[PDB]
Design a protein around this ligand. Sequence first.
Ligand SMILES: NC(=O)C1=CN([C@@H]2O[C@H](COP(=O)(O)OP(=O)(O)OC[C@H]3O[C@@H](n4cnc5c(N)ncnc54)[C@H](OP(=O)(O)O)[C@@H]3O)[C@@H](O)[C@H]2O)C=CC1
Ligand SMILES: CN(Cc1cnc2nc(N)nc(N)c2n1)c1ccc(C(=O)N[C@@H](CCC(=O)O)C(=O)O)cc1
Length: 159
Amino acid sequence: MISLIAALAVDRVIGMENAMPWNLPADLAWFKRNTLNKPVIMGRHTWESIGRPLPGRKNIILSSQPGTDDRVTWVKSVDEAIAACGDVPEIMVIGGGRVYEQFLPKAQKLYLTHIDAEVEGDTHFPDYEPDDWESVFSEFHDADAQNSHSYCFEILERR
Ligand SMILES: NC(=O)C1=CN([C@@H]2O[C@H](COP(=O)(O)OP(=O)(O)OC[C@H]3O[C@@H](n4cnc5c(N)ncnc54)[C@H](OP(=O)(O)O)[C@@H]3O)[C@@H](O)[C@H]2O)C=CC1
Ligand SMILES: CN(Cc1cnc2nc(N)nc(N)c2n1)c1ccc(C(=O)N[C@@H](CCC(=O)O)C(=O)O)cc1
């Protein structure tokens, strides 16, 4: 199965200037929890933001150009990215916006972090029909000294 995992501020904002307009270590800990020991597919801009291989995950980077880090797997198309995951129970697609657009129609599950931040984005999560998805999990958290916004984890499954 293919899953997307993403963090969305108000109005579907996911990015601005190749960064995220928030700083939420709790969301990174949820991201780690839900991606560990699964292959992760990401776009080249996202890979450059991360800056190193994510431990405990096969890291698969989409780019039309030859790879520039021998520690990770580079692929030139959506089908090659999926093939590189081999036979696993769950492939995780971790961004950015261009990659989410391509994989959303193939996905059966969404792991969303809804961040209560009103911030400008240049990159937005794709729209999709809410009736197509069933919410199966929610977990609310208030802001705290390390996470300046409240946020709510949610998992949805395609109906
Ligand atoms: N809030 C969140 O959950 C997340 C937010 N983000 C944010 O998203 C933004 C980045 O998104 P975006 O700019 O869309 O970039 P992406 O990270 O999606 O990377 C885009 C690049 O990936 C490569 N690529 C994508 N699809 C294909 C394909 N089918 N075949 C070949 N190469 C492909 C291309 O690289 P090349 O140019 O080398 O061909 C393309 O330029 C940033 O603001 C980042 O912070 C990122 C991850 C998670
Ligand atoms: C830029 N980027 C992409 C990123 C960031 N937040 C996300 N948040 C969610 N919910 N979903 C994503 N796809 C997502 N992707 C990053 C940047 C750093 C780390 C990272 O350092 N993660 C550590 C965890 C650090 C911590 O646990 O507090 C890990 O091992 O996964 C992950 C993704």
